[PDB]
Write a protein that binds this ligand. Structure first.
Ligand code: HEM
Ligand code: NA
Length: 333
């Protein structure tokens, strides 16, 4: 873990060369289109973001500080409807188990029955508590554990042939809000997305997700762009970030425009039968990205050719031409 970085204000976040090398570049082709891009979330490629179910990286402490600031300002970024309390404990069990197995240098868990002892050495936390007893922890169980893992989480109730957004911790969204979406069903919360409904992507995806079983989790990548390494690109805080989309120039694209990738996990939670949706968010500046000339060339092509409704949906419209012109320099054809 490097020195504390910000994702707001002075934007001190930056990637080491190792963090650049493992960035999850999301484009298998020189153009992008929506699809059901799901695969089994099996461990692969040691050192990569796909090695473990939950990826903890160099920015862990910085990010947890960012989460804490968001929640200090707005505790309503975390919501757990009462029927989802068991699912919140399932989520805390899954995260603590995997973190302690995969990063034993940073996390430890020992248990006897419902007497659990969790240590997070990175954050100086040493907690003895009662699994299932929310008065035993300093806050509600989903908030407790997600204050200690990178990325956002939604917890979906599966009922009546659908998924319902009935709990979550959403502090680094790509321009959406859990308080807006609370209680919505799968196709409903997806209503603003262009193209993909008519394509069948959401029908097919819902069907795959409803069939997810314990021990066979699934993953996909999503992406967008963000100006500055701003994690909290929420409706709630628009006045703090939306203006930056007018600040891109030919001279500053490389330092301002960031590629944002979401490594998404869908995992069945074993007591409750709920579905955990992890949204692990990676950021890389274009100066960093173009370190890799194959990434640079491919991003030029993607951005030049991206369907306008998809560009508009992603919020790239205002700076897209400047961006495209800048990236063209890295594309020998
Ligand atoms: C339960 C699991 C999922 C949750 C909770 C979730 C949630 C969301 C939310 C809240 C948005 C933003 C909508 C907005 O603009 O207000 C979104 C966008 C999107 N979702 Fe999902 N989603 C899930 C699963 C999937 C799956 C399996 C696919 C498969 C393709 C998918 C594809 C998309 C697409 C294509 C967009 C537009 C993203 C972009 O263009 O950057 N989602 N999702
Ligand atoms: Na294809």
């Amino acid at each position: 873990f490097k020195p504390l970085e910000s994702y707001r204000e002075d934007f001190s976040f930056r990637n080491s060369p190792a963090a650049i090398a493992r960035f999850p570049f999301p484009f298998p082709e020189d153009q992008y289109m929506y699809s059901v891009n799901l695969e089994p979330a099996v461990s692969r490629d040691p050192g990569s973001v796909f090695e473990h179910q939950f990826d903890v990286d160099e920015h862990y402490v910085s990010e947890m500080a960012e989460r804490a600031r968001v929640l200090e300002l707005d505790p309503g970024r975390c919501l757990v409807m009462p029927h989802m309390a068991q699912a919140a404990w399932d989520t805390l069990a899954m995260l603590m188990e995997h973190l302690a197995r995969d990063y034993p240098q940073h996390f430890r868990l020992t248990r006897q029955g419902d007497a659990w002892h969790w240590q997070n050495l990175a954050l100086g936390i040493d907690q003895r508590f009662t699994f299932g007893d929310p008065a035993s922890l300093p806050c509600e169980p989903l908030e407790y554990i997600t204050r200690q893992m990178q990325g956002d989480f939604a917890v979906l109730d599966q009922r009546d042939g659908d998924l319902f957004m009935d709990a979550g911790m959403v502090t680094c969204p790509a321009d959406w809000s859990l308080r807006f979406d609370a209680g919505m069903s799968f196709k409903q919360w997806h209503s603003p997305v262009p193209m993909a409904h008519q394509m069948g992507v959401f029908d097919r995806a819902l069907k795959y997700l409803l069939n997810i079983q314990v021990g066979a989790p699934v993953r996909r990548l999503n992406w967008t762009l963000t100006i500055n390494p701003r994690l909290d690109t929420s409706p709630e805080t628009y006045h703090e970030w939306g203006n930056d989309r007018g600040k891109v120039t030919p001279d500053n694209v490389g330092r301002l425009v960031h590629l944002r990738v979401e490594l998404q996990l869908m995992a069945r939670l074993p007591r409750s039968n709920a579905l955990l949706f992890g949204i692990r968010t990676y950021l890389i500046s274009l100066d960093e990205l173009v370190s890799n000339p194959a990434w640079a060339q491919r991003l030029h092509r993607v951005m030049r050719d991206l369907p306008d409704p998809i560009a508009d949906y992603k919020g790239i419209t205002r700076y897209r031409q400047t961006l495209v012109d800048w990236l063209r320099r890295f594309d020998p054809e």
